[PDB]
Design a protein around this ligand. Structure first.
Ligand SMILES: O=C(O)CNC(=O)C(=O)O
Ligand SMILES: [Mg+2]
Ligand code: NI
Ligand SMILES: [Zn+2]
Length: 331
């Protein structure tokens, strides 16, 4: 069995290997990359996402989200308070202000220590989930707006044509902006490209151990767990690496830098934080190996998780027994 300790693997494809996206994902899986839940892909030196980032300041962040924490430093939830619209140039200036800027630090490990010590005492503002793309249309390799769609994959594998679309999303971050513990909708893959700026630190639980994280989360968030049998779908709970280690939960960590891709694999729980002002692009995707995970994915039906239009068909076709209850949660 390849990668039996479920370590995060880092890949350096050549320009020739960067042509065929599906083939390279399958290659990484042949080497055991999925067992970690997360892999890093460093593009060949010949590749670029676009020519420059000098002209992005006028993108609008219609609904910036202030991430307010509750709990203790290592075990907390966050809620998202909506703020007034602002441009990317306005948000960059805000991120660099004395109130929000990255503190002085020695290295990524020092900054990580500072994040976990102090995150709860601040409320950073995240420009998340903005439909759009920063890949140039002429970038032919690993262009996250030109991937095979999940609807087409389901149709290819299972024969059923379904409605829905699959487009990327932009994320503008600042110091301490946080992504809570989650797997993807319908336990899909995700791919995330860090276009510019400061790093993003990731934590991940191997897919084979995801239920250990779920059991800990039910213990640590007992009111939330009574409210919903899949409350991590709400994307609000944080647990620190120190608490995971105290409770014996297997996990790994890695820092993504500008110019790097990360892939999350089906049922790979992940969480993390941004080091400072940055911009990432991410999208969900599927392969043949995903279908069995999609069929088994948990679902939130309490009403909180509320998701995209295109999840309806995935539930309807892959999980017909759960469909009626899930759709009630959507309405
Ligand atoms: O970058 C973020 O805030 C969150 N990203 C992801 O969870 C992802 O790419 O799957
Ligand atoms: Mg612009
Ligand atoms: Ni994710
Ligand atoms: Zn729920």
């Amino acid at each position: 069995a390849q990668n039996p300790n479920c370590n995060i693997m880092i890949f350096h494809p050549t320009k020739e290997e960067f042509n065929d996206f599906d083939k390279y994902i399958a290659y990484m899986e042949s080497q055991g990359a999925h067992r970690a839940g997360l892999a890093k892909i460093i593009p060949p030196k010949e590749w670029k996402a676009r020519e420059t980032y000098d002209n992005i300041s006028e993108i609008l962040i219609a609904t910036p989200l202030q991430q307010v924490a509750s709990g203790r430093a290592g075990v907390f939830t966050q809620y998202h308070k909506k703020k007034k619209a602002m441009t990317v140039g306005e948000y960059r200036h805000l991120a660099n202000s004395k109130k929000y800027q990255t503190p002085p630090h020695q290295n990524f490990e020092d900054l990580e220590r500072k994040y976990w010590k102090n995150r709860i005492y601040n409320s950073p503002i995240y420009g998340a989930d903005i439909s759009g793309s920063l890949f140039d249309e002429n970038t032919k390799q690993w262009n996250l707006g030109h991937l095979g769609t999940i609807q087409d994959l389901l149709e290819k594998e299972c024969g059923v044509v379904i409605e829905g679309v699959n487009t990327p999303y932009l994320y503008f971050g600042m110091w301490k902006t946080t992504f809570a513990w989650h797997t993807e909708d319908m336990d899909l893959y995700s791919i995330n490209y860090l276009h510019l700026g400061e790093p993003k630190t990731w934590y991940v639980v191997p897919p084979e151990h995801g239920q250990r994280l779920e059991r800990l989360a039910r213990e640590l968030f007992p009111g939330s767990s009574r409210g919903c049998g899949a409350f991590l779908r709400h994307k609000v709970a944080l647990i620190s690496p120190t608490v995971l280690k105290e409770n014996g939960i297997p996990f790994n960590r890695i820092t993504q830098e500008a110019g790097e891709f990360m892939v999350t694999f089906p049922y790979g729980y992940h969480a993390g934080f941004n080091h400072g002002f940055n911009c990432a692009e991410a999208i969900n995707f599927a392969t043949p190996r995903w279908i069995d995970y999609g069929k088994m994915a948990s679902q939130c039906s309490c009403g909180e998780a509320r998701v995209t239009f295109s999840m309806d068909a995935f539930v309807r076709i892959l999980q017909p027994e759960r469909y009626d209850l899930w759709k009630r949660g959507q309405d």
